[PDB]
Amino acid sequence: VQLVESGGGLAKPGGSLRLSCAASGFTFSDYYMDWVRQAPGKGLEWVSRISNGGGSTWYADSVKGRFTISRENAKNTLYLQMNSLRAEDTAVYYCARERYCSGGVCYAGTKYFDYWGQGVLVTVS
Amino acid sequence: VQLVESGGGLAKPGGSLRLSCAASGFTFSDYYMDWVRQAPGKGLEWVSRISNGGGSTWYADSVKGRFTISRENAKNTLYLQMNSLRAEDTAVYYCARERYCSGGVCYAGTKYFDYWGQGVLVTVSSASTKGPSVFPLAPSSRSTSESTAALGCLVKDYFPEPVTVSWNSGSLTSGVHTFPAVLQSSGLYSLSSVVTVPSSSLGTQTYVCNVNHKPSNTKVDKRVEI
Amino acid sequence: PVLTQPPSLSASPGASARLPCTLSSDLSVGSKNMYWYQQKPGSAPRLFLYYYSDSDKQLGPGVPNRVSGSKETSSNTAFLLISGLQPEDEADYYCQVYDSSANWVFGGGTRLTVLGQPKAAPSVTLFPPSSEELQANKATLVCLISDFYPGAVEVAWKADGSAVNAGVETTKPSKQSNNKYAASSYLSLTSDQWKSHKSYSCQVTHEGSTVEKTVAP
Amino acid sequence: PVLTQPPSLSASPGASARLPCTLSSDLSVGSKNMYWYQQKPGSAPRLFLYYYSDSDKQLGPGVPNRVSGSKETSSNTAFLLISGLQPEDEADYYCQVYDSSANWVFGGGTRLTVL
Amino acid sequence: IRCIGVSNRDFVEGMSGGTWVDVVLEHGGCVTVMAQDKPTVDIELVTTTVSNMAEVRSYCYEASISDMASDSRCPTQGEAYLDKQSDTQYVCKRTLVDRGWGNGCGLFGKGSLVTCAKFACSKKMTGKSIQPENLEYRIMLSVHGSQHSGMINRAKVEITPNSPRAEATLGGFGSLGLDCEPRTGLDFSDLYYLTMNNKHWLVHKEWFHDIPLPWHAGADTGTPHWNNKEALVEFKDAHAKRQTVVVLGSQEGAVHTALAGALEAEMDGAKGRLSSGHLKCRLKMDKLRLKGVSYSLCTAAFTFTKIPAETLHGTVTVEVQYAGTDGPCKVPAQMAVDMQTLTPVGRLITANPVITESTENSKMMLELDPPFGDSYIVIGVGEKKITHHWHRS
Amino acid sequence: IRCIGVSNRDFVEGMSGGTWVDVVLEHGGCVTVMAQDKPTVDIELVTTTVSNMAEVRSYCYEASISDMASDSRCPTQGEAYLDKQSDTQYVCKRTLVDRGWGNGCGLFGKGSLVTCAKFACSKKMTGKSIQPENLEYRIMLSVHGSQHSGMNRAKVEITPNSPRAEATLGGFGSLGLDCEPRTGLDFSDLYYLTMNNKHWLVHKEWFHDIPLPWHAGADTGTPHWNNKEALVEFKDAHAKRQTVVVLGSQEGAVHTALAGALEAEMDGAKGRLSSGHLKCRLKMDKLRLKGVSYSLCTAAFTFTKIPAETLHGTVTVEVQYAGTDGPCKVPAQMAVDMQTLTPVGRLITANPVITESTENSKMMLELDPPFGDSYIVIGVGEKKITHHWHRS
């Protein structure tokens, strides 16, 4: 049960990036997944959420129209296509797994971030 | 709410008597009735039983075929027709009222004997009746010497109990002691009743004892003199 | 079905008297309405207690609050309880139940004896024969014993010191309305058996002691 | 939807510390699942505490029994119980609830410092 | 100014002149009364109470069994007997069972057997009569001219079937009368009021007479007497001398199922609240002066604080804010298809909209009845007035 | 010596020689086996239990409601949301309610409203499956020669996969049982239902349809109730608060729906059943009588009970024997009035005996008298006792 992430680096304003978070060991086609970013020494802000099959996705207010979370459950990887990058996207990003929810009515209604990704740094300038 | 019995007396073996139970103070037509008897100096024995309408009667085994219980609610009277009496039928017979029920069932299902009558004595025996001889029992020639003085009445040789004695036509009851009767070997009874009178009340107050014995129709007034 | 009762029961004054009533083998005390009656001398019985359980009971009219009942299912026995035992509770107590077949069964009755009552010696009055009886050539001697406790006397008749054995009838004791006892004794003589001796005497004995009252022609 | 926890406050061993998270008025705190996380300098956060009520609770993998929960509706504020302090509390503890409108919300954060 | 968001609300137009308005008041519904020279008033029936209801019958839905015994008789010995089969608190069942030498009889055959148990009610339901003369009606009034938050002067009255007239004093607006007539309490002779565990309904009168449960038809006596207690006690499996007694358990959920689709009503405490209405009222409001017609028009400017919102009945509600110490003053408010100037097209629901405060940034709400098609809400005087487009149906 | 007053009684007569007797043992019925040179034996089936019943489904018939909340949103603001609407222990109902400026919304119309409450079951019923291979039969045996009783003597236990058994009856020897040519009254269609502390046998389809909350396991940590909406009702949604009520106890409701079902006791953790019918071939080649080397009793007899006719015409007699002659055979027969004591009927008790030595012991026997008039005669010569009898 492992979470690593690839695709960091540098990108000027207007440029694009494609973040990937490859997962393994569990049934990736079952879980809800989540991206959440963090500027250096700043607060924590949720960015994007995606369902088990990818049929419905949610984004934070400051991000929609440009970022697009996606999921191919066959390769067990989580993508985050960041288009039209701007300066305040300067942050370190993690992919988080949302707790097991077979049904939609899990044993206590928890649905939280148990496992987290290591964390990639994105710098926009 | 009172019950009184009538129709006692002396019968011969094979004769008949009609006991009656007069009831007043309650709706006599709403109550089961019973006759209970008791031989002299013995326990209680249940005789018969009747419903409030009269179409359901029960009898002790020792009585079946002889005694007839009945009731005429109109005259407010319970009856016990006693036919072909045997010597063992000699006893006091009380009429008893059961507890009332609102149908068949009642609160707690209690059906005990609410009230009992006074009782009538029934004596059966082949012996004939004898009326008593009433003699005075005078004081002892020393009137105002001790605290008081005691005079009485002797009721001698009468067969069937009971004898009733009062003094001065009922106007005198304080200090009157009538003794239970002796049963002499000749089959006849004898009774004695005395009253302690004030020591000096011998001069002005005159004392007469009234003896009544119904089964022989004897009513005597023998007044006591020195 | 029969109801067994001890013929006599004695219980100390102020204490409790447990009058028992054992039902026959075919009845169960647990499911019987027990009816208790009290009968004092010379008077008819009256309802004393209805008892089925401690939450199902009934005092008879005028019966004090010191009386109750109980049942011991292990001996098939009902109990009439009278606490604060006063001498006014001396009577016969009869237990009675109903059955659909025997239709009304009475106990034998238990005569209650309240101990601790003070002993009282009899008062005795000897009466000579009347004149109207003597004119009829008969003469009977009346001896009236009253107000004595406990209830047992022995009367003896004497004529000129010699014991009189003939023509003497004597009764049994009988409870007075004041808890004591009364009795009487009669000596039937012809007019010529009278007028012969100097004196006749009634001689009453109670708890060993003796009185002698005498009369004379 | 917004929830505000103070920037930081330092707590010492031998005492008890309460970490608040003042929720807004559009949320009733008494009907909210509270998720608190633990993040150290450099390392990524892992689940620290789940709390809805004192009977409806579970704690993250590898966390000891000194931490519990509390929630008072008169303040509309949830509290992270951190009792029995030790200087080893070096972690920024975030306060997270979910909403079918705001879709995830984190507090400002609280850096557990110890003097 | 209640009755704004109420779905079942009636707009009654009065007669100009005589103080005539005949309204029909329900529960959950209300009426906006509009007179000619008089303020628009809302009238709603909020509370129907019934006091001192007389009990009719009580059903037992949970029973208990107590001291139980049996009695058995051998063949030919007649029918079995227990002393408590004569007891009104006992349920008994008599049966025939095989007797022989092994259980204790001298013959072989069929013997009688009876078994009794003491009945006790743990929990009971109670039905009551209502008798319309102990009803009480509570009516709430309020006038227009107010502001949105002030939803929640304003008056309240009480009305009795034999005291149906009432008058309420509304500040400087005066007074209003009500002369009312009830009709639908029991509708006649029916509709008992039932009380279960701790909640209450209104049941059909005949349906209540047919509930298959133990019952006593009084109010209460020392140790009640239950009729037909055989409905909750079952006897089974008689052996030779013992018959086992069973109690059926709580029937509470059974009557809940038979109470699906009945009319419920709360109660706290000992007075019965009701959710049924239907009393008609003739209102006379001749002693209802407006509030102030001696005000001047507001000279300063307005601003929409909320988007004007359409109610369920096509009426438009508007709230504006007034910047200026001009108050108190009349609000200029009107309607449609201008390109000034400037014919009023619709009609207002609020009679004489006013600004109540003097200084300085007060709020105020009004309600319009717009014409169909396109229209223009215009508030304010001359220039620097505010306008909002509206489209009806 | 059971089976005397039993109404449902079969008298099986064997054949002299091979120990073949096929009997049918029921509940409430018994059989008297009579062989030629062998003691008469009573055989009854007293207990049929079925053990290790596996739970299938549990229904909740009494519920409780706990911490309850609501959530409301304005028109166009989407559907209301509570964190516990995702909880399996909560029952929720979603509906739309009239919103306006008075509740705190900017528009007039219908807004979403949800209300949840935490569900808990107070009392539940349990249905279990029964498997015929877990049945167990309890058989009681007893012989004749005894005294008034039935309130030596043996007992056996029988399983479908261990159907053979043998019981040792003192000096009478032993008799074996090989039991099952026709047995079951049903299975595979009935669950075994348990309510508060009572038990039924219900049809599977009727049980599959009970409208109550239910969980389809045996038990897990904190079970999960399905269709919990069946005991919790929502009513009177205002704008922001919906009151939740829990329905009263449904125990009396299913008792009424269980009228005309077959009831069943339980003792203990094994379910007792009132159906029987196991057939048995009993082998009694090892059944010696007890003693034929006794002599006839010389002393006199006395009736202790009035001779009683049973339901099948047989007569039961109990006598008392005064004398230390015992143990000895009891002289017993039935004369035909009288010519000279020629045997007329037949005995049910084989070889009546007095067992004790001293001194006034009692003993019971059973006769099969012929129809018409007859005389029960017990004893020899003089000091014998005779009783007249008439059959049917």
Please state, in angstroms and rounded to a whole number, the distance separating the CA atoms of residues E300 and B189: 134
Please state, in angstroms and rounded to a whole number, the distance separating the CA atoms of residues D96 and D106: 5
Residue F9: which of F29, F25, F24, F26 has the closest Cα? F29
Provide the H-helix boundaries in chain E. Answer: 205-208, 252-258
Q: Does B152 touch chain C (CB under 8 A)?
A: yes
- Report how far apart, in Å, the C-alpha atoms of E60 and of each of E192, E249, F62 are: 17, 11, 19
State the pairing for strand pair C8-11/C110-114.
Answer: parallel
Q: In what order do the strands lie in the sheet with F372-378?
A: F332-335, F372-378, F385-391
What is the radius of gyration, based on Cα positions, of chain C? 24
3-state SS class at D79: strand
* Resolution of the model in angstroms: 2.8
Please state, in angstroms and rounded to a whole number, the distance separating the CA atoms of residues E198 and E112: 45
E104: left (phi over 0), alpha (psi -120 to 50) or beta: left
F377: left (phi over 0), alpha (psi -120 to 50) or beta: beta
CB atoms within 10 A of CB F260: 5
Q: Are F227 and F99 in contact (CB under 8 A)?
A: no
Please state, in angstroms and rounded to a whole number, the distance separating the CA atoms of residues F207 and B83: 73
- Report how far apart, in Å, the C-alpha atoms of C168 and of each of A34, B188, B224, C213, E186 are: 130, 14, 25, 16, 94
Please state, in angstroms and rounded to a whole number, the distance separating the CA atoms of residues E97 and E94: 10
Q: Are E33 and E12 in contact (CB under 8 A)?
A: yes
Contacts of E83 in chain B (CB under 8 A): 109
Which positions 11-70 of A are in contact with D (Cβ < 8 Å)?
A: 34, 36, 43-46, 49, 58, 60
Residue F372: which of F352, F356, F391 has the closest Cα? F391
Q: Does B112 touch chain C (CB under 8 A)?
A: yes
Please state, in angstroms and rounded to a whole number, the distance separating the CA atoms of residues F263 and F273: 9
Q: Which residues contact E248 (CB under 8 A, 6 or more apart)?
A: E63, E231, E232, E233, E234, F252, F255, F256
Angle, alpha carbons E371-E376-E378 (nearest 5°): 120
Instruction: Name the fold adopted by F300-391.
Output: Immunoglobulin-like (2.60.40)
Q: Are B52 and B30 in contact (CB under 8 A)?
A: yes
Q: Which of C114, C144, C167 is the last residue of a domain?
A: C114
Please state, in angstroms and rounded to a whole number, the distance separating the CA atoms of residues B225 and A121: 148
Q: Which two tokens stand for residue F274?
A: 């009132």
Residue C12: which of C85, C90, C76 has the closest Cα? C85
Backbone angles phi, psi at F107, to 5 degrees: -120, 165
Q: Are E229 and E91 in contact (CB under 8 A)?
A: yes
CB atoms within 10 A of CB B200: 12
CA contacts within 13 A on the Cβ side of A26? 16
Looking up residue D66, the CATH number of its domain turns out to be 2.60.40.10
Q: Are D52 and D32 in contact (CB under 8 A)?
A: yes
Backbone angles phi, psi at F257, to 5 degrees: -75, -5
One-character DSSP codes across E285-354: -TTB--S-SSPEEP-S-EEESS--EE-TTS-EEEEEEEESTT-SEEPPEE-SS-SSS----SEESSSS-E
Kindly tell me whether chain B and chain D come into contact, counting contact as 3+ Cβ pairs under 8 Å.
Answer: no
Angle, alpha carbons F255-F261-F264 (nearest 5°): 90
| B106 secondary structure, DSSP code | B
What was the elucidation method? X-ray
For residue C132, the one-letter residue type is E
User: Taking CB atoms and an 8 Å limit, are C28 and E69 in contact across chains?
Assistant: yes
Residues C104 and C142 in one domain: no
The burial class, CB within 10 Å (0-12 / 13-18 / 19+), for E211 is buried
Q: Are F131 and F190 in contact (CB under 8 A)?
A: no
Angle, alpha carbons F339-F345-F346 (nearest 5°): 140
Please state, in angstroms and rounded to a whole number, the distance separating the CA atoms of residues B208 and D67: 112
Please state, in angstroms and rounded to a whole number, the distance separating the CA atoms of residues B51 and B73: 11
Kindly tell me whether chain D and chain A come into contact, counting contact as 3+ Cβ pairs under 8 Å.
Answer: yes
* Partner chains of C (3+ C-beta pairs under 8 Å): B, E
Please state, in angstroms and rounded to a whole number, the distance separating the CA atoms of residues F344 and B97: 61
What is the radius of gyration, based on Cα positions, of chain F? 35
| CATH number among 3.40.640.10, 2.60.40.350, 3.30.470.20, 3.40.50.720, domain E296-392 | 2.60.40.350
Residues C23 and C88 in one domain: yes
Residue with tokens 């309607």: E335
Residue F309: which of F390, F374, F379 has the closest Cα? F390
Q: In what helix (H) or strand (E) does residue F98 lie, and over which residues does it extend?
A: strand F90-99
B104: left (phi over 0), alpha (psi -120 to 50) or beta: alpha
Which positions 104-123 of E are in contact with C (Cβ < 8 Å)?
A: 116
Please state, in angstroms and rounded to a whole number, the distance separating the CA atoms of residues C168 and C141: 9
User: Taking CB atoms and an 8 Å limit, are F5 and E103 in contact across chains?
Assistant: yes
Q: In what helix (H) or strand (E) does residue F207 lie, and over which residues does it extend?
A: helix F204-207
Residue C99: which of E240, F227, F288, E86 has the closest Cα? E86
Please state, in angstroms and rounded to a whole number, the distance separating the CA atoms of residues F273 and F27: 9
Domain count, chain D: 1
For residue E47, the one-letter residue type is T
Distance of residue D53 Cα from the nearest chain F Cα, in angstroms: 10
Q: Does E94 touch chain B (CB under 8 A)?
A: no
Q: Which residue(s) pair with F118 in the sheet?
A: F90
Exposure b/e, F54-81, CB count within 10 A at least 16 = b: ebbbbbbbbbeeeebbbbbbbbeeeebb
Q: Does C56 touch chain B (CB under 8 A)?
A: yes
Backbone angles phi, psi at A55, to 5 degrees: -75, -5
Q: Are B98 and B113 in contact (CB under 8 A)?
A: yes
Q: Please name each of the domains of chain B with its CATH number.
A: 2-124 (2.60.40.10), 133-224 (2.60.40.10)
Residue E236: which of F271, F195, F263 has the closest Cα? F263
- Report how far apart, in Å, the C-alpha atoms of E111 and of each of E99, E100, F148 are: 6, 9, 20
Q: Which two tokens stand for residue D74?
A: 């008169």
Residue with tokens 């709230």: E319
State the pairing for strand pair F278-283/F173-178.
Answer: antiparallel
Q: Which residues contact F359 (CB under 8 A, 6 or more apart)?
A: F322, F323, F324
Which of A1, A35, A44 to mutate to test binding with chain D, by most D CBs within 10 Å of its CB? Answer: A44
Assess whether the previous peptide bond of E328 is cis (omega < 30° from 0): yes
| B89 secondary structure, DSSP code | G
Q: Which two tokens stand for residue E227?
A: 């009729």
Q: Which residue(s) pair with A70 in the sheet?
A: A79
The burial class, CB within 10 Å (0-12 / 13-18 / 19+), for D27 is buried
Beta strands in D60-110 (DSSP E): 67-72, 77-83, 92-97, 105-106
3-state SS class at B37: strand
- Report how far apart, in Å, the C-alpha atoms of B41 and of each of A7, B44, B91, C177, D29 are: 123, 10, 9, 17, 92
Backbone angles phi, psi at B28, to 5 degrees: -55, -20
Residues C110 and C127 in one domain: no
Q: Which two tokens stand for residue D2?
A: 């917004």
Contacts of F198 in chain E (CB under 8 A): 246
Q: Which residues contact E283 (CB under 8 A, 6 or more apart)?
A: E19, E21, E22, E23, E33, E43, E176, E177, E178, E179
Q: Which residues contact B201 (CB under 8 A, 6 or more apart)?
A: none
Q: Which two tokens stand for residue C106?
A: 């009475």
3-state SS class at E34: strand
Q: In what helix (H) or strand (E) does residue B82 lie, and over which residues does it extend?
A: strand B77-83
CB atoms within 10 A of CB C5: 23
Backbone angles phi, psi at B62, to 5 degrees: -70, 5
Range of the domain at D34: 3-112
Assess whether the previous peptide bond of A43 is cis (omega < 30° from 0): no
- Report how far apart, in Å, the C-alpha atoms of F298 and of each of E342, F327, F379, F380 are: 143, 11, 8, 7
Contacts of B117 in chain C (CB under 8 A): 44
Q: Which of C114, C143, C171 is the last residue of a domain?
A: C114
Please state, in angstroms and rounded to a whole number, the distance separating the CA atoms of residues F379 and C129: 76
Residue F304: which of F94, F152, F153, F147 has the closest Cα? F147
